[PDB]
Paper text:
The sole target for neutralizing antibodies on the virus surface is the envelope (Env) protein, a homotrimer consisting of three copies of gp120 and gp41 subunits that are associated by non-covalent interactions. Methods enabling the production of stable recombinant trimer immunogens based on the ectodomain of Env have catalyzed recent HIV vaccine efforts. Hence, the efficient trafficking of Env trimer immunogens to follicles following immunization is likely essential to promote optimal humoral responses to HIV. Here, we demonstrate two strategies to concentrate HIV Env immunogens in follicles, via the formation of immune complexes (ICs) or by employing self-assembling protein nanoparticles for multivalent display of Env antigens.
Residue numbers in the entry:
A (entry chain F), B (entry chain A): 1 to 122
C (entry chain B), D (entry chain N), E (entry chain Q): 2 to 99
Amino acid sequence: GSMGNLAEKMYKAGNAMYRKGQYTIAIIAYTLALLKDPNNAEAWYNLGNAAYKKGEYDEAIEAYQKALELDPNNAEAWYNLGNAYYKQGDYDEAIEYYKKALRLDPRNVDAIENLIEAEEKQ
Amino acid sequence: GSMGNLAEKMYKAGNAMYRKGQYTIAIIAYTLALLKDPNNAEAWYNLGNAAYKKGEYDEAIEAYQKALELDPNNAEAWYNLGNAYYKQGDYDEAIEYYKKALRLDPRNVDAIENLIEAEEKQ
Amino acid sequence: EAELAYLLGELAYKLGEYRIAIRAYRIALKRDPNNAEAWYNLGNAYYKQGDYREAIRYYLRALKLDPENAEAWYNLGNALYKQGKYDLAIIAYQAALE
Amino acid sequence: EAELAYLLGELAYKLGEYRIAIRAYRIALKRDPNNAEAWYNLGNAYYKQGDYREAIRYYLRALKLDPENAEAWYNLGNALYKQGKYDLAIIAYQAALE
Amino acid sequence: EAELAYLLGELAYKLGEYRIAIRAYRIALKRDPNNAEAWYNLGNAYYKQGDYREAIRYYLRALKLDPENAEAWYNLGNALYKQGKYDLAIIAYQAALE
């Protein structure tokens, strides 16, 4: 009925837990920050990062995709999505996602390295 | 739709985490206990204590203030609010909050020590 | 040897040799910081010398160690009063009564 | 450090601060049990405080260490007298004369 | 001794003795993996020998260590171009311009 800064408190806690490697806690915290306000691309992104840290990349994909739906200029989300797709053997999507990251930032050398491998693995 | 003891379970978990110094978890737990029932001055207070432990005293202030709104006789909340204001350089509020704590309990020697310093810093 | 320093402190205090008493209490306290009575008496010696800020600091410390010492509460109130800290002096005086 | 404790004892004693003197003599004695004079003065401090049983115990100890102290014999007699131990007080008084 | 291996690498490179330069750079790099310039030049030596896959691997590594090396970005683009990796070559070429 109030809790005006709820999302902020949960978000900040999520960030602390992510930094400390406590991804399960961070997932809970980010999820809660978003649960009452699912409009923060940063939290969707960090939720994806925590999921990525966990290893369940498919969950990470959904979260990163949502971050892009809120903000398509998040090159890093594009990159990690490409990485998630790459990990799953989906080299065709890995390529598309890495290319999008590079259109946003052509100097992302890691996206280039991973794109090169995706084309070779494809 | 049920969860009759939800707040109690979350509150108790919050207390355990506070005792163990796990303030981020404790904040989440207290927040949840209050989120579905934001009427426990003790939880508002302990939420404030966990925030105080974290160091984000401004958040601690809001939580302690709410505890006082629910119960203005919480001298300890008055004291920590005074401490939070003091930390922020607001010596004028630090004084008012410490005095209120002392009206409730004149023997709170720490509130007196901090009030003395607030008057000197003012 | 803190126990001997302590006794010198009390003797000097009673005799009005507050400067000696202060050094002696500080010696005893340096060795044993939890001696609330020595902190109280240290505060009294400073009070007697006119240093009411130090008297306050030590009365508060003595009270933290022992909140029941009505005399420390009272003397705290006196030192505060001397410094013009009247709301505080009143609170400390009431604390002594409580 | 017993020597300093001893001196504090004498000073406190002379000044009438018998409670301080007692603790100080006990400190010196704990470190050096053969100080007959300190035992004597300890007994005197107890005597001054009305504890004539302790005064007796210490006068006797001082006398065991030094049987020639006529004053300890006399004060022993006084403490005994105070306790109603008259035959003993008389003997101690005579011992002082002997 | 990596510093000497490094210098041999540069000398051999300049002289067209790319096979020598490659071994020498690898020696220097084995001892010191953070030498971005050596990685770049290693990539160039492989490029000169026609191994454009190795040239890519090393240009990328050099760039990870130093993202500002426009020449590595450009040469990365060239090696990619040689391999038919045109979208990538274009991106690397743009990266050099950026």
